[PDB]
Structures are given as structure tokens and as C-alpha cells.
Amino acid sequence: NICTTRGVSSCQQCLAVSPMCAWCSDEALPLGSPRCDLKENLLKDNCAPESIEFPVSEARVLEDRPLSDKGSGDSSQVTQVSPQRIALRLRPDDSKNFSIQVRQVEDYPVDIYYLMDLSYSMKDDLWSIQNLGTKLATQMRKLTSNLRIGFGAFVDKPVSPYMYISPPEALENPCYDMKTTCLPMFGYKHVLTLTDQVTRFNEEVKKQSVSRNRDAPEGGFDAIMQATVCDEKIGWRNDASHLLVFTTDAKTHIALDGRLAGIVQPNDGQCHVGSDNHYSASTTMDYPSLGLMTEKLSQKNINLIFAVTENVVNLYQNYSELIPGTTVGVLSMDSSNVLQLIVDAYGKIRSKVELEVRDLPEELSLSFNATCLNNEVIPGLKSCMGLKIGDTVSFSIEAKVRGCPQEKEKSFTIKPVGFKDSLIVQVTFDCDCACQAQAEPNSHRCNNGNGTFECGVCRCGPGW
Amino acid sequence: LNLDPVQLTFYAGPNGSQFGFSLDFHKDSHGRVAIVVGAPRTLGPSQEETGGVFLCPWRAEGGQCPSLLFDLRDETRNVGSQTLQTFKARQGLGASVVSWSDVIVACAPWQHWNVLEKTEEAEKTPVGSCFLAQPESGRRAEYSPCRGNTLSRIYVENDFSWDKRYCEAGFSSVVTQAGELVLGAPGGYYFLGLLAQAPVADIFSSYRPGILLWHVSSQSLSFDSSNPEYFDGYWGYSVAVGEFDGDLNTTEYVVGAPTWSWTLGAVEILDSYYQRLHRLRGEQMASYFGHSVAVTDVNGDGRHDLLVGAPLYMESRADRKLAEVGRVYLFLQPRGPHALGAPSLLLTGTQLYGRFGSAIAPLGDLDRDGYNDIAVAAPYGGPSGRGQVLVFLGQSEGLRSRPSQVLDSPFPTGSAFGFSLRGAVDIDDNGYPDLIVGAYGANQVAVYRAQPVV
């Protein structure tokens, strides 16, 4: 076989030949018997069973908590991935399979932060949602028992030419030349931290009012960034779905637009909402780019929802494709349908399961078979869709190591996007022989001190 | 390839002035080359930011520069039962500078303007303004084509048509070889964007101080539109000129509209009457295709070619993920009367958030091989994010896909090294064209001298 025909010099080299090769460290071995051969052929030559060195690739589980039936209760002791941890052992140019299960646990906590365009055209919208807090609570009650909602508003950067700056009266009341009154212009302001007291939402919304600015596109992306990276102030929970509902009826300003206000400093993606609850860098820092927005949304596990009017739906659908994980809904001209829009988005959000791999060594390569719907295997697939809350799917995984790496212990992670739980795979590369840990440096048997004796043969010492 | 990165020359301005935001070379009547530098946040008379301009003489050791003085006082004129007002606070003088012949043009895109009449007003808005100077003689002039005396009520009654109150003229600028100044005004016509043009000679001969509202009859402005594709397009964010219609008697305009058609972005080529000859559409929304434009024949066929920068372009990568790195497009002009087709080459940044293609400077023939070359800035690129400038050499088939040389920023983090570029001029007179690089974040400019090929 390939083991004997390779003519290996040491036990180390023997194992590297093939996963089917074995080595014999027996002293009483015949004249010309190959120490590197199939484990079966070795035993046939009266080779001491203890002297046989033949590692076997395996994979046993360390943590295997059962998947939760309900996401309610418990201080986040919920299991939605199983197993959670497994030990993997591989030898040179070998592979081993292992499975993983993922469930969309029923009755999981939910955070919903309502981020609203409050420019002048949204004046009518503000009237429609004065009971949204309670109505929304009633409907989400059927899906979760841990709801928290919050509210924030935005218009655009309070600086010329976006802002009217004359006469002085127009600064305190931009609507001065229209026989009405509105709030002074503001970029972004946090109003209500996420809370389970939903009537707080209704009452806060009833005291809100619109402002007014000059150009159609608005500064919503500023608000999205701050609402994302200001954890403590907004109040996102660790173990809960995070929904950021973004409503507007207009186009949006994007990175580099700010130069029309003399603002060139790039957005830094840091929090700048102080105790006054306003975005303090609005007039000194440029709008964020799609890429920077994506990074932070992903980092904080935020599901962005574009609930926009039909006149701009195509626009935000096209943006949605550049910010994966985002969903779009058609909002009425008065936001009268925003309730159902949110409930549907939540459904679509928890209808997918997409695996992701982190910290995978260069030497390892993976492959996935997916089992979605009704026990239907799907080769080379690692993402299931069309799922309903409560459903469970499974993936068959196979890892193949290319050669043997310098570092003999590494670990990587397999986690579903957006999920809290994950599978940790502790890999161990077994390419060494046990007899090597008891060699004889400067052995009397090997060229009289000029060699080392390990695993039954003589090796050329270090320095030659 | 052959710029010297060892012995640089540094020019510096006051802290916080943003010295180096814009720059250009300047030749005096005798051919002596100098560098004009804009500093949009230089302090003015009332200890408030107004911007400023500097004219730095060439010196191997660099240093400080003398000021090119302009009037920084707010003006008021009571005439025709109205009151005209200019406001220079935070006007950003030096946000763009350009030199032609022995004249310098420096613009203040955010200079504000208003007109009062009894209890009514036009509204205090940023029409922008340009300042012109002939340093040797001392002659000064101004040009502000977007100023008007129409009251707010009238715009409302006419549905806000031909509304040039927020032009920000001077946002971008360029001068034709014949001495015609072209201004980009991305805020013109309620944020569609417009272009203003007028002979430099006529700007001087028709200007008088204290008038504020005067006519330049030989000027020509672009037109308003009702096509929603142009709304909030910022047409004129960047501008350049060149020869694209085979007729050498006419000069064609190249205009950037980075948010055209719902932030798809576009670049258009026009004749001197603002009639459109070609349009180049963006590849990806929000990439800011058109942020920068450069004209130059890179393949040595005598036909000007076009370069477009899209600094926010997101490249596709493993696992369906996107990475904002920036991209530059090369369009070669074909023989005879034909339309510019698909791009001939795509250059793509590598550093995340590097903004490759934020600026593109024609270098002329750096290595003297017969083909013109270019420089591309990535003001936050490089392995340290400090900024980088990459040089690409011309060839018979367009441009080399790999840079021949890379310039790492000598300044600290946040200097914006490369945000402004300018080459194709031999400042030390050694027979090789040199490169100047602005770093407004550090309030400094760096001069790279070209040397014989090693």
C-alpha cells in the first residue's frame, strides 16, 4: 500500500502519509517488516497491540443543552442552538462530520424603537399614531410576553441652507410665515427609552410636534447611527430582538452631502447624545455612510425596518439591498397602517436562519447540508428561509484539514446571524506519536551518540 | 514612479485654518511658479472664521507664506428702496482656488446674502461668491452670479422656479484656456445644481466696489428642470473642461452630479451652451459617483479621456458582504463622432473607509515615456489609515492597473492627506512635472519633486 511504498523515516512522517496509515514501535519486529502500514497488516506480523500508533479522527460533544420550548421566563437561560460546544480531533489530511440544530424560539423578548421623521409633511402622521403604543402592545401580546417600546424623532441638520435663518423670528418658529407655529429645527432627539410601560409611548407621542426645513431629503441616517450606538440611552436589551422602525415620506441625506453646510469631518460612529437628549455633533459631523451604518447595526444586532411611503419605496428597497438584514414596508400617507407593517416585518425577520463562521483557521475548510421545511436535505446550503416562529432546522457540517498546522490547538465559532447562542468548536490536531514523548537523545544505539532513538528507529540528531 | 519621497518640502498655515483645503500652481508674468493655497477657516477681522488665501513662493525648505489680501468686511447698500446685504462670517473663503494666466480666483461657497424691503425680505441664503486678484498689479474683482433682489413672496407665487438663492457658487471652479471662468453651484435652482460662466476679462471690466448687484452681460447660466431625476442632484459638485466633440473651436464642459437620479450619481458632458452630449450613470447608489472628475489624454492618442471618482463605492467580498473602499472609472474617448462606451478600466481601493478616488490629479508625463499619468488620493487609506496617494502610469491601452508608486502621509492621523491634489507643473524647473498635496487637517501642504528615473 501507499504506506509501505512511501518509505517513511519516522512515525511522524508515517501518519502524515494517509489517515489510514499506522505505525509500529515494537522492538521485536522482523528483518524487513515495514513499520508504516495498515493497522491490520501490522497485527498480522505479531506487532504488540500497545506499540501500535494509530490516531482516529473523532468528534464528541461537551455541552449539549436541549433547545428551549419557550423564550419567556429565565434571565436569558434560553437555548436556541444545540449543541453549544464540541471537541474535534483531526489527523493530517482527514475530515469528520458533526451536526447542529437551530430553533426560532417562541415567545422571545422584543425591543421596538420607533424612529420618526417629524418634518412638516408628517404633521398628519403624528395624529394617527397617538394610540399606537397600546394598540401595538395588544397585537404583539400574541407573539411575545416581553415587549419594550421607545421613541425618537429627527428632522435634519439645524444649519443653513437646510435651516431657515431669517428673520430672527424664523429661528424660534420656522413656520412664522405661514400663520402657524412649529418647533425650532432639530437634528435628532431621544424621547423615550425602551420600556414596558406602553402608555408612556402614547403620552409622549401626544406632546410631540413637527418642525420645518428647506430641502426635501432629511437627516434620518444621523438618527439611525445614534439610535444604534447609544446603547444605554436607547436601552436595548442583551437578550431580545431589536427592531429599529424608521418612518419617512422623503429621500434621505447621505455621506458627503454635508459639504453643502461646510461640514467635512467624517462621521466617527461614536455616541454623541448627552443628558439633553439631542445629537450634539449634528452641525459639526457629516452624515454616516451605508457601510459604517451596516457595521454598527451588525455590531449591536439591530434589525432596521424602512417603513416609507410608496413615492419613495423603490429608493429604500434599493438601499435595503446594500444593507443586508433590512426589511421594507409600504407606509400610508398618514402612517395609518404602521401597526400591521411592524407586525409583518417582525414575522419576516424571524423567518430566516443563516449560519456564519468566525475565526476559522486557514487549514480548515467547511461544507454544509441544509435540512429545512420537512426533512428536505439541500447540499451546499447553509441558510433556511420561509420559517415560522417555533420551527426548527438542522445542518450537517464537515471539516477537512489540509496537512498539519504548527499550532496543534485552535477553536472557532458557528453562529446564526442575529442570534445570541453559538456553537464553539474546539479543534485539536493530532499528528504526533505518543512514543515521541519518550525518545533517547544521544542514544548509544544510533551511530554511537550521533543520533536519537524514538519510536523504534534512529533519527539524525539536532545540528546535523 | 519617480517622485522623491525622501526630501519633501512643507508649507504651513495657522492652526485651525484648514490651510491646504484647496490649492493650485501659479505663474507670474515672468513664468516664476508659486503655490496658491486656500484656508477656508482662517480668522478674519472680528476674530471670526472667514477663510483666507496664501501665495507661497517656491523654496526647497518651505515654511510660512504671505497672505493674498481680500476684503472681509460685510457690506450694505441702500438703493432702489431696498437694502442689499452681504455676510462673510463663515463664508469659507478659499474652499476652492484656481489659477489662470497671472490671475488667481478664490471662492467663498458659503457667503450669505439677503435683501430687505420694508417688512419683506429675500431670505438670508448662501449664494456664494468668488474673489479675483492680479497679485502683481494689485487689481481686485468679485463675481457672484446667484445674487438677486426678488422677495420671498414672489418665489412662492411662482412655485420656486429659477431659484438661485442657495447656489453656493464657487463650490467647484475651473477656467478654460481662453480665459472663461466656470463655477459649479450644486445648490442652484432649489438644489438641482447649476453652472455659471463668464470671461475673466469681463468680470474685471464690469466690477466696481460697493455696487453689490451688477450685470455681466457676457455671462451664461445653465437651466432649471422639471425632471425629478435632477432633484437634489448637486449638479456642479465638481467641474472640469476638455475637448470631446472633435471641434477645436468649441470647449466642452464636464460636470459631476454625485446624487443624480435618487443618489445613483452621474457625470455629464456639455457644449458651451449647456446642451448635453453624453451622460455617464453611476454603478452603485450612494457611492458618490461624480464626486471628482479629471480630464486628460492618458493613452497618447491626442484625444482627451475622462476619469470619474466614486469614493464611497462598496466592493463585493466573500460571504455576500460589502466593503466601502472607493472606485475610479476610466473612459477613453473613441475616434470620430461616437459616444463614450463602457469604462475601459476600474481601479478599486483596498483600505476600508479609505475613500479611494476622493481626488484625481492629472500629472502630465511624470516618467517622460510619452504617456500622461495620474494620481489618485485615498485620504484615509494606507495600513494605518493616515492617508495615501497612488500614482498610475499611462499606456497605449489606457492606464496600468497597478500603481507605480505610493506616497504615505508624513502627517499624523486625521490630516486628510490627499483631499486636494494638483500636478503637471514643474515648480523647480528640473524638466520634470511635480506634485503638491494638501492636508487641511494638519494645516499643511507637501511638495513632491519628480526626479530622473532611477
Binding site: 412638516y120 404633521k123 426645513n213 428647506r214 426635501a216 422623503a250 | 420656486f160 438644489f191 437634489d232
Partner: peptide, 6 residues
Amino acid sequence: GRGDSP
């Protein structure tokens, strides 16, 4: 105009 208003 092409700005903030229904």
C-alpha cells in the same frame, strides 16, 4: 418647492 411640505 422640491422640499419639506405635503
